[PDB]
């Protein structure tokens, strides 16, 4: 538990130096579960990068910060935000990463209606990421609209890996209570050993976000919502009359209480609903800079 002991460990795995030596004009754009996010300008080029800053002292579980380094070093992908370099800056871990200038999906689902071509495009992109992550043993454990970032051209990428975990033949299940209340899988809230299926449940909840604008039981306090996820039947859309039977059938393979019966990322990529998926250009008009 020594802060300065943990600073020393982090120092051995991160890149040397201080990125303020080549970055200008830090501006805070977001706040996450483990820290804040800034936009910065690369002095030499004028390009923009993102900088996640995470205070070692504010972490509940300091050792999860290594997830940021583990993902950066070994699991890059088309639909995963790219991480360039990590630094120890005083008491903070800084990750210089790709700037997803179109913002988070949350700003879209809370201010406009997505049609199913856009929803299917989001789901397809997120499922391509998860099928590759799951195949290599990596569980995200914090899937929600806040964790889905967009390019200005509508490309969709997975972000915020600060809570992920690895499984393998020697460690086939995780047991940690991790995630965001309204999005957590039932077996996770039940403290059962779980695997990649919890990401599939969380994506189902995010589908409900895109249809309803908010996850189920969002008006209830977080602990009450978790008990209702644990004990009640799968949460239903508030607007079932507004989803095509194709979308409802997709969602039904997602929000299955028995994780053995839940569809996997690999299976879901074959579902007919994803044939509705539009190109990234179809997400562009949803973003704040382009809405009315």
């Amino acid at each position: 538990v020594s802060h300065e002991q943990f600073r020393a460990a982090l120092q051995l795995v991160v890149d040397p130096g201080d990125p303020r030596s080549y970055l200008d004009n830090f501006i805070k754009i977001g706040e996450g579960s483990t820290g804040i996010v800034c936009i910065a300008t690369v002095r030499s080029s004028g390009k923009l990068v993102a900088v996640k800053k995470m205070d070692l002292r504010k972490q509940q579980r300091r050792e999860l910060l290594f997830n940021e380094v583990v993902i950066m070093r070994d699991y890059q992908h088309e639909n995963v935000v790219e991480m360039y370099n990590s630094y120890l800056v005083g008491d903070e871990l800084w990750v210089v990463m790709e700037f997803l200038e179109g913002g988070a999906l949350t700003d879209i689902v809370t201010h406009t209606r997505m049609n199913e071509e856009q929803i299917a495009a989001v789901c397809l992109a997120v499922l391509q990421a998860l099928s590759v992550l799951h195949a290599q043993g990596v569980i995200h454990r914090d899937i929600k609209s806040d964790s889905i970032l967009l390019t200005h051209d509508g490309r969709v990428k997975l972000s915020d890996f600060g809570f992920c975990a690895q499984v393998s033949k020697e460690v086939p299940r995780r047991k940690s209570l991790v995630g965001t209340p309204y999005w957590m899988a039932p077996e996770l809230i039940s403290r059962l050993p779980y695997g990649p299926e919890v990401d599939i449940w969380s994506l189902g909840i995010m589908v409900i976000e895109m249809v309803d604008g908010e996850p189920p039981y969002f008006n209830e306090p977080p602990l009450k919502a978790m008990k209702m996820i644990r004990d009640n039947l799968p949460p239903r859309l508030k607007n079932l009359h507004k989803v095509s039977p194709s979308l409802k059938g997709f969602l039904d393979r997602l929000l299955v209480r028995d994780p053995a019966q839940r569809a996997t990322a690999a299976e879901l990529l074959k579902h007919p609903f994803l044939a509705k998926a539009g190109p990234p250009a179809s997400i562009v008009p949803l973003m704040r800079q382009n809405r009315t």
């Binding site: 996450g32 579960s33 483990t34 509940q60 949350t106 914090d142 929600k144 806040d146 809570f163 209570l177 991790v178 995630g179 965001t180 209340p181 977080p222």
Partner: peptide
Amino acid sequence: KRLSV
């Protein structure tokens, strides 16, 4: 609250 635990 959209805050992760």
